[PDB]
Structure formats: C-alpha cells, structure tokens
Amino acid sequence: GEFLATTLERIEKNFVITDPRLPDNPIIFASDSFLQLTEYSREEILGRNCRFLQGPETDRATVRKIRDAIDNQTEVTVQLINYTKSGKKFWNLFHLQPMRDQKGDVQYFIGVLLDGTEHVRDAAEREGVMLIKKTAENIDEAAKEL
Numbered sequence: 001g002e003f004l005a006t007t008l009e010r011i012e013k014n015f016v017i018t019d020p021r022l023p024d025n026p027i028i029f030a031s032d033s034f035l036q037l038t039e040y041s042r043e044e045i046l047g048r049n050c051r052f053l054q055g056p057e058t059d060r061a062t063v064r065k066i067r068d069a070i071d072n073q074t075e076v077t078v079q080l081i082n083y084t085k086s087g088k089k090f091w092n093l094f095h096l097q098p099m100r101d102q103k104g105d106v107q108y109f110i111g112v113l114l115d116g117t118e119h120v121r122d123a124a125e126r127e128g129v130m131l132i133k134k135t136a137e138n139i140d141e142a143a144k145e146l
C-alpha cells in the first residue's frame with residue numbers, strides 16, 4: 001500500500017503520533033496495529049485529525065476531556081466508544097500525552113489505544129492503564145529523535 005510502515009509503526013501496539021505544530025493536529029504516524037484495529041489504510045488517515053474514530057455512541061463529555069488535555073498540553077486517560085471503518089464499535093481505553101523536545105516544548109502528541117469490548121473497571125482498568133502508560137513511555141523514547 002501507499003506509505004510503507006516505518007520501524008516505529010511496526011511497534012506491536014495501537015498508537016498514533018500527531019503534529020500540532022499542522023492543520024487540525026493530524027496524524028503523521030499510525031502503527032500497523034492501529035490500522036488493523038480501525039480498518040483504515042495508512043494513506044486514508046495521514047493528515048486527518050483522529051476524531052474520525054468518533055460516532056453516535058461516543059460520549060461527547062469524554063471527547064471534551066481529550067480536547068482540554070491537548071489545549072493544556074497535559075496527559076489524560078479516558079475510555080470512550082470509537083468506530084472502525086466498517087462501523088464496528090469498540091471501547092477505547094485511551095492515553096494521551098505530549099512529547100517534549102530538549103527545550104521542553106511540545107513537539108508531538110502520542111495517543112495509545114487499548115481496544116476492548118466493554119468499559120473496564122477495577123483490575124482490568126488498572127492492568128490496561130499499566131499497559132498503555134508503559135507503551136506511551138517507549139513511544140516517547142522512539143519518537144524523541146524523529
């Protein structure tokens with residue numbers, strides 16, 4: 001397909017990297033697992049804001065939590081319903097955080113997705129957050145010199 005996966009994009013997790021410094025803070029890198037999850041080609045989502053994953057059952061208060069984290073340049077972890085290309089709904093245990101350069105300025109946003117079948121709580125929530133935070137920290141290491 002168009003836009004061969006970079007080594008970063010073959011990391012075995014669902015994530016995207018956006019560039020705020022571009023119009024509507026769009027996706028510039030998307031992992032192979034993210035494309036498998038969402039059913040989009042890479043060429044179908046590069047240069048688009050991630051909000052295309054939202055649909056009728058997505059809680060809009062939760063979306064605004066993500067908006068406010070981006071605006072305040074800070075992390076957030078939320079759960080929300082997202083939609084594939086085929087309209088299959090999935091729960092997304094989602095973690096955002098900024099990636100900072102050597103001056104401390106936000107250079108990218110990293111978003112890590114753990115797709116599930118229900119809203120999770122208690123142990124499943126804790127283990128999911130452990131996994132997506134750990135993942136975000138390796139992507140912050142990978143993405144640092146892009």
Ligand SMILES: Cc1cc2nc3c(=O)[nH]c(=O)nc-3n(C[C@H](O)[C@H](O)[C@H](O)COP(=O)(O)O)c2cc1C
Pocket residue numbers: 016017018025049050051053054063064066067070080082092094096109110111112113
């Ligand atoms: C790095 C990054 C990844 C994102 N990943 C998702 C995602 O997986 N699912 C989603 O519903 N929104 C995701 N978003 C949130 C939307 O892109 C957008 O910020 C949100 O819809 C709020 O902005 P809006 O009110 O203009 O839509 C992501 C945003 C960024 C910056």
Ligand SMILES: [Cl-]
Pocket residue numbers: 062077078079080
């Ligand atoms: Cl939430």
